[PDB]
């Protein structure tokens, strides 16, 4: 029911969705590996004058002790905590997460 979770959408279909010019910087979605349940990626739209509209994909790593992270220095207890956090602060990303991908 998470507006931003798109299940097993492929990398290519996720870029086609996110690359739409009406998506503001930071539009994003979370997707899952097709084979590995629980293995997630955060796909996000961005823009700069070098690459123009582009999509960045971050593997959402899992610690053995449980937990999720896209950069090891910032650990979360769940996907919702992580998405909530980067929606408030870029904290290293080029831009904070904004619109859930439509």
């Amino acid at each position: 029911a998470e507006e931003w979770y798109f299940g097993k959408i492929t990398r290519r279909e996720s870029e086609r969705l996110l690359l739409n010019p009406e998506n503001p910087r930071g539009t994003f979605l979370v997707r899952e590996s097709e084979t590995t349940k629980g293995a997630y990626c955060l796909s996000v739209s961005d823009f700069d004058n070098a690459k123009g509209l582009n999509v960045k994909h971050y593997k959402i790593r899992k610690l053995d002790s449980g937990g999720f992270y896209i950069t090891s220095r910032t650990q979360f207890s769940s996907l919702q905590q992580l998405v909530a956090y980067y929606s408030k602060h870029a904290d290293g990303l080029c831009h904070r997460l904004t619109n859930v991908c439509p």
Binding site: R11, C41, Y58, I70, L93
Partner: peptide, 7 residues
């Protein structure tokens, strides 16, 4: 292909 990363 490729997976972004940041410090």
């Amino acid at each position: 292909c490729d997976y972004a990363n940041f410090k």
